[PDB]
Design an enzyme around this catalytic site. Sequence first.
Site, PDB file in Angstrom:
ATOM      1  N   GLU A  11     -23.470  20.863   3.527  1.00 46.20           N
ATOM      2  CA  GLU A  11     -23.472  21.390   4.868  1.00 46.20           C
ATOM      3  C   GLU A  11     -24.725  22.163   5.255  1.00 46.20           C
ATOM      4  O   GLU A  11     -25.067  22.242   6.436  1.00 46.20           O
ATOM      5  CB  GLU A  11     -22.250  22.296   5.075  1.00 46.20           C
ATOM      6  N   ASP A  20     -24.045  19.894  15.173  1.00 47.89           N
ATOM      7  CA  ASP A  20     -23.728  19.121  14.007  1.00 47.89           C
ATOM      8  C   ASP A  20     -24.129  17.649  14.189  1.00 47.89           C
ATOM      9  O   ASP A  20     -24.680  17.237  15.204  1.00 47.89           O
ATOM     10  CB  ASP A  20     -22.283  19.369  13.518  1.00 47.89           C
ATOM     11  N   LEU A  32     -17.528  24.788  12.393  1.00 46.50           N
ATOM     12  CA  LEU A  32     -17.392  24.245  13.758  1.00 46.50           C
ATOM     13  C   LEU A  32     -16.831  25.242  14.732  1.00 46.50           C
ATOM     14  O   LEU A  32     -15.827  25.885  14.503  1.00 46.50           O
ATOM     15  CB  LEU A  32     -16.526  23.014  13.823  1.00 46.50           C
ATOM     16  N   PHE A 104     -12.469  19.945   4.432  1.00 46.19           N
ATOM     17  CA  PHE A 104     -13.314  20.880   5.093  1.00 46.19           C
ATOM     18  C   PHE A 104     -14.105  20.132   6.218  1.00 46.19           C
ATOM     19  O   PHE A 104     -14.233  20.573   7.303  1.00 46.19           O
ATOM     20  CB  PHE A 104     -14.303  21.289   4.013  1.00 46.19           C
TER      21      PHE A 104
END
Length: 162
Positions: A11, A20, A32, A104
């Site tokens: 990430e 993103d 998010l 996730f």
Amino acid sequence: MNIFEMLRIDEGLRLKIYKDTEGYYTIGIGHLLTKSPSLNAAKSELDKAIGRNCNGVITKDEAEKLFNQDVDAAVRGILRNAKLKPVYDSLDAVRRCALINMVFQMGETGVAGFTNSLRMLQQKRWDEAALNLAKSRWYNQTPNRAKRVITTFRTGTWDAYK
Ligand SMILES: [Cl-]
Ligand SMILES: [Cl-]
């Protein structure tokens, strides 16, 4: 290698609101914020999330606190989910991390929709499950990350991350 180190690799870390891969407003370690086009909708969720006026910017500590909550939420969701719990219970330590990784990323709902793949993992048919997972929008959109998770499932080791 652990789950936190794995997700931090997949990430990245960013202290300023960003978009993103899908175009959505994110901050920190894949946290998010909103699916809404508005940066203002994002900035508001962000202050709601941190409990302060951030004006789209956060500290390392704040990013980590958020990361702690997300991984935790991800683990409790799997445990509470009727379709996910059994797969998770049937798996070894490494592969467990891989399932947390997908949850996730795509939420409980998305992973729970990978019916066939879940069935093959539960059955321990590694290779077949790996080929099946590759047939998804997920793999098409973020191939390098998908490959890393998928190899983790196929092999049961941290090779893709080392
Ligand atoms: Cl496909
Ligand atoms: Cl990728």
